[PDB]
Design a protein around this ligand. Structure first.
Ligand SMILES: Nc1ncnc2c1ncn2[C@@H]1O[C@H](COP(=O)(O)OP(=O)(O)O)[C@@H](O)[C@H]1O
Ligand SMILES: Nc1ncnc2c1ncn2[C@@H]1O[C@H](COP(=O)(O)OP(=O)(O)O)[C@@H](O)[C@H]1O
Ligand SMILES: [Mg+2]
Ligand SMILES: [Mg+2]
Ligand SMILES: [Mg+2]
Ligand SMILES: [Mg+2]
Lengths: 194, 198
């Protein structure tokens, strides 16, 4: 339960989150919540924080590009962010929409949501829990997910490495631009996958 | 074609000096890069004397031990972040100072092409791009991606640079090897030419 961080009960918070997104997307979010709570109890991070980070991580996934461009300007974010896309924005910039809409103040939860797509070179246990739960949640079936599910309850750092390497390989396979912080993560975790 | 405007060597004197730096297999790779760079230069209009010499010298420091590059980094007070990397990054990015000390090369354009022949840059001249693709598509290189790279290189040089940089990043990912940040600079600057290709 999440009342230490937000003035919402569960039924109201899930209703508010559900107002932001498609049913396929909201079902993904509940899967990430289940996956993050089970990773939190395995690795010992606070499940109240893990579960809430999971419920909110894709809160801004469906906002149009202008919402993120306006937040970049309003909160004086690095102007270089404006050259990117929703993949980068919905976490890195969407945390400002989460704070405005919901009043979330917890730095640890906000940071985990902020980097849940691109990672960082230095990630806390909470950051890694969400980063892996988002990938391995039960509704995601893609062939590369299944080894990540196995790695994740043995060694969390190797689960992060596996995701970041497969992401850089996927982006390269489509010739899509790789955000520089995604490289920070890749180089920081490359050795755990070796 | 001949390079005495830039170095105090004739061809036989220069090729003897280069062959002293490296294995015979590596020297055969270098002669091939010279052939491909000359064949890229008259087509796209860069100076073949500048292109051929950059190709002859690009792997001059390939076989130097790590301490040669660490000593050069300190001596020329290059970025300390370079010391965390490896020969793959150093032999062009730092090896240009060994070329300058050993051979007296001062041509800024040739030196810059050698400097980034492995990792690229976000901004590349025509000469830089010629060397970068010539090194990849050279006649002795046989790996599965060579043939499409050779095909692209005669239509669109920017799409050939894009093809090499994007495929280099995918290879490094397949081995979990660390990617130098300037390689990403190249990748992100050229990724759009490979989308249009694809
Ligand atoms: N560093 C990066 N640069 C560009 N695109 C990226 C980068 N990292 C991840 N992506 C892409 O972002 C997309 C969204 O990812 P993510 O937030 O992890 O999950 P979801 O869509 O569940 O929100 C994926 O399609 C992924 O390939
Ligand atoms: N960013 C990078 N990080 C680590 N290795 C790299 C990077 N970019 C290229 N390499 C590697 O450097 C090696 C030597 O490359 P290169 O200099 O282009 O060949 P040559 O040595 O014939 O001129 C290749 O194995 C390539 O995969
Ligand atoms: Mg997301
Ligand atoms: Mg998600
Ligand atoms: Mg080389
Ligand atoms: Mg070479």
């Amino acid at each position: 339960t999440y009342e230490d961080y937000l003035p919402y009960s569960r039924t109201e918070l899930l209703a508010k989150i559900a107002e932001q997104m498609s049913p396929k997307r909201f079902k993904h979010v509940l899967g990430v919540e289940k996956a993050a709570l089970s990773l939190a109890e395995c690795y010992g991070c606070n499940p109240d924080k893990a579960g809430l980070a999971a419920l909110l991580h894709d809160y801004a996934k469906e906002c149009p590009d202008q919402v993120f461009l306006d937040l970049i300007d309003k909160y004086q974010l690095s102007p270089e962010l404006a050259k990117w896309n929703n993949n980068v924005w919905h976490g890195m910039v969407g945390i400002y929409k989460i704070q405005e809409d919901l009043g979330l103040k917890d730095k640890d939860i906000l940071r985990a949501i902020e980097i849940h797509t691109v990672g960082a070179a230095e990630m806390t246990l909470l950051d890694k829990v969400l980063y892996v739960a988002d990938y391995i949640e039960e509704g995601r079936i893609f062939p590369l997910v299944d080894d990540a599910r196995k790695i994740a309850k043995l060694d969390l750092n190797q689960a992060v490495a596996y995701e970041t390497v497969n992401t850089v390989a996927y982006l390269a396979s489509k010739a899509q631009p790789i955000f520089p912080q995604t490289l920070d993560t890749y180089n920081a975790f490359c050795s755990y996958l070796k």
